[PDB]
Write a protein that binds this DNA or RNA. Sequence first.
DNA 1: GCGAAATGGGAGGGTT
DNA 2: TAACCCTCCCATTTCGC
Length: 109
Amino acid sequence: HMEKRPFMCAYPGCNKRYFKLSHLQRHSRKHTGEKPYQCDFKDCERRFSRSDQLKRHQRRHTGVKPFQCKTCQRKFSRSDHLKTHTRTHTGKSCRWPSCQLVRHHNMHQ
DNA sequence: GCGAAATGGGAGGGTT
DNA sequence: TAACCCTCCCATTTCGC
Ligand SMILES: [Zn+2]
Ligand SMILES: [Zn+2]
Ligand SMILES: [Zn+2]
Ligand SMILES: [Zn+2]
């Protein structure tokens, strides 16, 4: 785990440093305040500085949930949302809250 | 209402 | 170069009861 960040931001007063030039060029859009990637869903009008941020956001509109829990078959749109959910099973036949297995799990969604 | 859990966004990291 | 996906932090919202 190295800390050498050779790419420094040239913005006046900014001390940001990054390991890769792509990370620095991605940071430079924060000073310009430009957010060109706008969500065109109804009654949203949200916008982001990065295209991947817009695609992550638009999954809440499209209902795309590629990540599925191997224990209770619950689906999530993000990998970190799935990993956090799996902690509910570590502490605690039906693995859904308040219910007494694949058919039952699939019917919950 | 309470705590837990889910949700959503920023920021940064890697892989092509 | 940058699209693309992952990982962590954080505040807010929703759920379970
Ligand atoms: Zn900067
Ligand atoms: Zn939207
Ligand atoms: Zn689960
Ligand atoms: Zn059940």
